[PDB]
């Protein structure tokens, strides 16, 4: 493939050099997916391609041929996790419910193409991002079947963005988009050997998303490298009236991420090494030790460290993530008169349908979530002060304070598990504080363990997705650790 | 509580 591995800006320059245009690029993707994707190993992470992604490169190329560039996207073709909206495909969260719901461009999606991207198409996930049932299966949905991690297409390519990093590691498109409640950037992103940002929940418009939790929900990029990730959160951070929570960013501005991209961004930095035992984890140890001593070279200080109140937060979290379930999808199926307009006819078209939606797993979450009391239940208003509390404040931020620290980091998560019948094999997380807390996590590849991709997870406190790009940056130049999948 |  000869844009496999391509930065966003070298493919950028190339554009502007008149050496490559957006259509080209954009039929290369579309033919890569079409014999990897839909064939070949069959990856699945594709569920609907974009039936004017062509129309859209040829208009993004007559604005260049005219002198009208849009930005350092301008031409470039991006995929889209299934939950979030974007005309004139539809937006199903991988059920078969809402097969013909098309809803219009959510507010990241209209800023990504006023910036030139083109939109090929969205990618595959854990349906209703895996918050539907028990012992539920990563990377499946009724409508797009199962995503397989490309590294080894027998196991898991984790998730619920299973298909956002399945494509950006497999190159089927150039960057993509994925959303996170707990773990779903973050961990598919590391389990596929590629790199997610969560950020700070307020920096991105959740508008135009199916939700699960308007207190700790994010979009977020997922790219192969660290400079292409901050081209995307550059174009996709701002505020929108429609989402209250882009409201409370302090001194919030038009801010060039890749600017962060230094580097000496280590230099002079402390950080926090996670005492968890994914660093025991098998065949972990070599690898945490050698990304410990690479940071060390680059000139942070880095100190063993615990994380106050790891797991205290897991009832809490249980609890708000239920309630706000509920209370935001409906919300979201009246904003944008979906075909189902309540959690009760989801559940009751499941098990209309149960032979092609219930035949895996059930919907024990969905059941649960509908018979939650309320957002005005002074249990969940508890649950949901304390969760925010115990993770952030008393959590991370208590970490950060006790050393001085700019971040914490520790492996992201373990390697992919077989997919098998049975519910994904979880091996264990670094990431669930800053999910809670609604601080910014981002993973960068670090290596692997007997060829499956692992991660190295950077987490700080909230807003500062700037020093973390800088210190991710300086991480990968000096490793350069990614390796793309054999086909 | 996994992966949402």
Not at chain 1, 15 to 28: C, F, H, I, P
Request: hydrophobic share 40%.
């Amino acid at each position: 493939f000869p844009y496999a591995e391509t930065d966003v800006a070298d493919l950028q320059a190339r554009m502007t050099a008149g050496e490559l245009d957006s259509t080209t690029l954009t039929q290369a993707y579309l033919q890569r997916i079409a014999a990897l994707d839909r064939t070949g190993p069959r990856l699945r992470a594709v569920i609907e391609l974009n039936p004017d992604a062509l129309k859209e490169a040829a208009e993004r190329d007559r604005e260049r041929r005219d002198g009208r560039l849009r930005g350092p996207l301008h031409g470039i073709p991006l995929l889209l996790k299934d939950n979030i909206n974007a005309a004139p495909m539809a937006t199903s969260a991988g059920s078969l419910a809402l097969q013909g719901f098309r809803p219009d461009d959510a507010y990241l999606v209209r800023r990504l193409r006023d910036a030139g991207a083109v939109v090929l198409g969205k990618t595959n996930l854990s349906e209703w991002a895996n918050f539907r049932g028990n012992d539920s299966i990563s990377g499946w949905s009724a409508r797009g079947g199962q995503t397989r991690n490309p590294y080894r297409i027998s196991h898991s390519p984790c998730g619920s963005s299973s298909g956002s990093a399945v494509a950006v590691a497999a190159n089927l498109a150039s960057v993509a988009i994925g959303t996170e409640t707990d773990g779903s950037i973050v961990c598919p992103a590391a389990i596929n050997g590629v790199v997610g940002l969560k950020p700070t929940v307020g920096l991105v418009s959740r508008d135009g998303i199916i939700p699960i939790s308007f207190s700790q929900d994010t979009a977020g990029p997922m790219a192969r490298s660290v400079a292409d990730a901050a081209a995307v959160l550059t174009a996709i951070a701002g505020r929108d009236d429609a989402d209250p929570a882009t409201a409370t960013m302090p001194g919030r501005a038009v801010y060039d991420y890749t600017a962060r991209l230094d580097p000496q961004g280590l230099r002079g930095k402390r950080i926090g090494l996670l005492q968890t035992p994914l660093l025991k984890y098998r065949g972990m140890p070599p690898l945490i030790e050698q990304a410990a001593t690479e940071l060390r070279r680059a000139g942070a200080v880095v100190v063993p460290v615990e994380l106050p109140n790891q797991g205290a937060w897991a009832e809490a979290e249980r609890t708000l993530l239920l309630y706000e379930f509920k209370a935001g999808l409906e919300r979201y199926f009246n904003t944008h008169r979906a075909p189902l307009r309540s959690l009760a006819d989801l559940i009751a078209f499941n098990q209309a349908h149960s032979k092609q939606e219930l035949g895996l797993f059930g919907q024990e979450l969905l059941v649960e979530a509908d018979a939650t009391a309320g957002l005005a239940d002074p249990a969940y208003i508890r649950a949901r002060s304390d969760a925010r509390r115990l993770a952030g404040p008393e959590g991370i931020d208590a970490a950060l304070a006790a050393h001085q620290l700019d971040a914490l980091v520790a492996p992201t998560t373990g390697v992919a598990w077989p997919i098998r019948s049975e519910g994904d094999d979880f091996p264990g997380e670094s990431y669930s504080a800053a999910a809670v807390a609604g601080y910014p996590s981002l993973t960068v590849p670090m290596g692997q363990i007997d060829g499956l991709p692992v991660g190295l997870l950077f987490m700080g406190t909230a807003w500062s997705e700037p020093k973390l790009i800088e210190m991710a940056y300086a991480y990968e130049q000096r490793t350069r650790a990614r390796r793309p999948p054999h086909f | 509580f996994x992966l949402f």
